[PDB]
Amino acid sequence: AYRFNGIGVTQNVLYENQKLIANQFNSAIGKIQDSLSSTASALGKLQDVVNQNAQALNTLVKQLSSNFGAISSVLNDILSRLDPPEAEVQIDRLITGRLQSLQTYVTQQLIRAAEIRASANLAATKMSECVLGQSKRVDFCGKGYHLMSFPQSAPHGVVFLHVTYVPAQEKNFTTAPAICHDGKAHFPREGVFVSNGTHWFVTQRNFYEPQIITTDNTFVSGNCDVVIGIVNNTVYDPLQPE
Amino acid sequence: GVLTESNKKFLPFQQFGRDIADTTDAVRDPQTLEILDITPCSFGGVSVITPGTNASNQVAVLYQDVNCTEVPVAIPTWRVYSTGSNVFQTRAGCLIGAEHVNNSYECDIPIGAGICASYQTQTASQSIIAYTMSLGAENSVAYSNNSIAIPTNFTISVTTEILPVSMTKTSVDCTMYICGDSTECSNLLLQYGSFCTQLNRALTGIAVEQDKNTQEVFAQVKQIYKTPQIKDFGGFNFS
Amino acid sequence: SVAYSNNSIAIPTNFTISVTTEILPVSMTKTSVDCTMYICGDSTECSNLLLQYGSFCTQLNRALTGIAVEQDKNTQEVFAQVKQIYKTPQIKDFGGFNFSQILPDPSKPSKRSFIEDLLFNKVTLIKQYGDCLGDIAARDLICAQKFNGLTVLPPLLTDEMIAQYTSALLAGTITSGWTFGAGAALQIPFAMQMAYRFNGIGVTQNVLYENQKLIANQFNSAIGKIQDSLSSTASALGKLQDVVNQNAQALNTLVKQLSSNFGAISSVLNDILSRLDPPEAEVQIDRLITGRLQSLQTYVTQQLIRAAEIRASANLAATKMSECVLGQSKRVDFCGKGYHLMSF
Ligand SMILES: *[C@@H]1O[C@H](CO)[C@@H](O)[C@H](O)[C@H]1NC(C)=O
Ligand SMILES: *[C@@H]1O[C@H](CO)[C@@H](O)[C@H](O)[C@H]1NC(C)=O
Ligand SMILES: *[C@@H]1O[C@H](CO)[C@@H](O)[C@H](O)[C@H]1NC(C)=O
Ligand SMILES: *[C@@H]1O[C@H](CO)[C@@H](O)[C@H](O)[C@H]1NC(C)=O
Ligand SMILES: *[C@@H]1O[C@H](CO)[C@@H](O)[C@H](O)[C@H]1NC(C)=O
Ligand SMILES: *[C@@H]1O[C@H](CO)[C@@H](O)[C@H](O)[C@H]1NC(C)=O
Ligand SMILES: *[C@@H]1O[C@H](CO)[C@@H](O)[C@H](O)[C@H]1NC(C)=O
């Protein structure tokens, strides 16, 4: 109920339809479990990271098979075939080449570490906001209006379950900005004046909860000429009859 | 290279000229006092579009900066992949080996400049087709100046977001990787030991950063709460 | 200084509608490098000693392809947030607001807006073998760098589809408010949407309805003012021009590096091969090969750094588009100075 009040829907609608909400939540959880069980190509990022690291190590190993202008790529052969003072040239060439390879590998590792650090910071702030609280930012914790968040641990990463609110099928209604009862403009406190065929009601923004127009739902202000689209109707007074 | 007529005229004491790349582009013929220009014979990029070799062996070739008419000027199997009957000029060079299709679907292999290539059953024969990209379903909103739409129902939805947290920590032994059980070597590495120390310091910094990331992401709260025994959550099943 | 007492308060009596411009880079030019062409330059004597460094060549090509696919991912993520494409309404009747400048004009190619036309004209951004062969007098750098295996790949999504996505987003946010961000779009009169925004920034909705004409006039005047300022002040799109100039300078200096001999007797392979026997020429060839490989590696590393910075900026732009455009943000200064109302 607190979450529903947070996303701008009155808390009573949750208590009116609790069983449906529980059934929908359970069905959605089962559906995503089945999707994870079936669709294998879902955890692309973690596999990409581990494959990238393995490929970097494998190519670093493979670099040893190239002679950087020397006569051979193995120190034992050079040392067996040549005297020290002249073989030192080939040894120096190989040393320079392998140092360059190591430096390149280290630099690429630094780049990847910086990118992973950025991703980790994003994950940390997402955990702080969406999981430990309710976020009013749009699309930060999933499409729709955010309600809850359940974290799960995955190797070299994290997966979030963003439980969200999505409005279903709608209807077409005729609306007016204000209502002129008796020479006085009236404006809705929280909702919008919606009119069906031959009646006027007031409803909340994100749900259809028709209500009769009373002095407790509207506040008076101004006159009946300034507003562009004012219409005539009647306002119920819940004190005069008594 | 390829020789051609040149408008430039050298000074009497000059023989050949050099460009910004410091290579010989213009020369003066010794037999006939004439100026000629030299240009490389290779110019242009080629890319090979293909589905998995597990699927099929057919390929489509994209020439980046060559019109299909001038393909013979640019360049058995290669000639077949250069002949016509399937040419299709695009905004990023002409494409040979694929069939144009009017319909638009989601992209599979991005050719570039709004063209995508994919494997489809153009009848159960298979052929590589090229089509324009599909942005999405067209739609319009019935907008008036006194009309509003209001939802009457709600649907609870759950989604998954996956983010990397850390990578594998590694360390490198420079002397072992370079020389290897060699007393003759590892004696000339005393000069580059400083570079070795620099690499080791960088790798240790990366590793401690990874540990810090792993700690920071999941250890936000300190007090550890035991799960309750009785669920009685009003209907929600957190099994 | 502020006249501060302990029982005194100041309260505004009027409001002014203001609009600002925020420019962020999204993507950089994609490049690919043919290492063998750049090093050996079509010599069969060379390209036989590059079999040892083919691994380095493959590494560079892999890194550059990764950068290119990252660029495509960035430009897709920034603008393709919403999927359903909404057609702009025919009748405007928006209560006074005139969105003519930003709404697309179908009387021109690519159906791009007036502001988009001016922005495209502000930033000063295909070739052929015959064109490069014939045009010798004008030493254009594009042909020279293309003769050395340096090619520029086009983006997957061109400007027309970007304009289409922008028009769809604008039409959705105008005819449906922010409800089209989550679920299906719901039509709402623009006055009601503006009242919703005013209620969001803590100002009672009635003050909007009492002062609609003044607000519409202020909005139109502000739009015209920024249009004139952008048409006059040229030094406004500094970041995008800086990005393209940086990429062009990097390519130009990579081309220029070919004129230095890394300790060899000469900087051209043809001269060394014509003056020396193979066994003693291989030393100079190896020196030049090592130098040019170092140059290519340096260029690749700098490109990686720039790509990382651009990715960070693109992520910021994507979240800004998600928050300020598809909704109303209560964070201060995130969507401009003042209290945020709209975003186009
Ligand atoms: C409008 O709502 C009132 C409320 O009772 C109802 O009596 C009336 O039939 C409705 N009009 C139409 C056209 O359904
Ligand atoms: C717009 O609304 C006004 C009243 O607010 C109405 O008089 C007018 O007819 C409406 N526009 C159209 C095209 O009907
Ligand atoms: C509303 O009522 C006033 C006074 O009774 C009248 O002048 C006005 O014309 C009415 N409006 C409509 C739309 O009938
Ligand atoms: C050089 O010899 C060629 C062939 O014998 C001849 O065509 C040419 O005219 C000669 N050049 C001069 C300057 O006589
Ligand atoms: C193609 O790939 C599938 C899935 O990886 C595999 O089962 C199949 O055996 C492959 N084809 C061949 C000819 O091996
Ligand atoms: C070459 O291709 C371009 C692509 O825009 C086209 O405009 C031009 O007419 C073509 N020229 C020839 C000779 O094919
Ligand atoms: C699509 O365009 C091509 C080229 O004009 C044409 O041959 C084909 O018939 C078109 N397809 C349809 C379904 O109109």
Ligand SMILES: *[C@@H]1O[C@H](CO)[C@@H](O)[C@H](O)[C@H]1NC(C)=O
């Ligand atoms: C709302 O949706 C649920 C499930 O789709 C359905 O059982 C319920 O009847 C719907 N509400 C109304 C008022 O039809």
Ligand SMILES: *[C@@H]1O[C@H](CO)[C@@H](O)[C@H](O)[C@H]1NC(C)=O
């Ligand atoms: C508020 O500012 C507008 C435009 O500057 C002006 O027309 C209006 O009179 C001002 N309000 C008051 C109460 O002076």
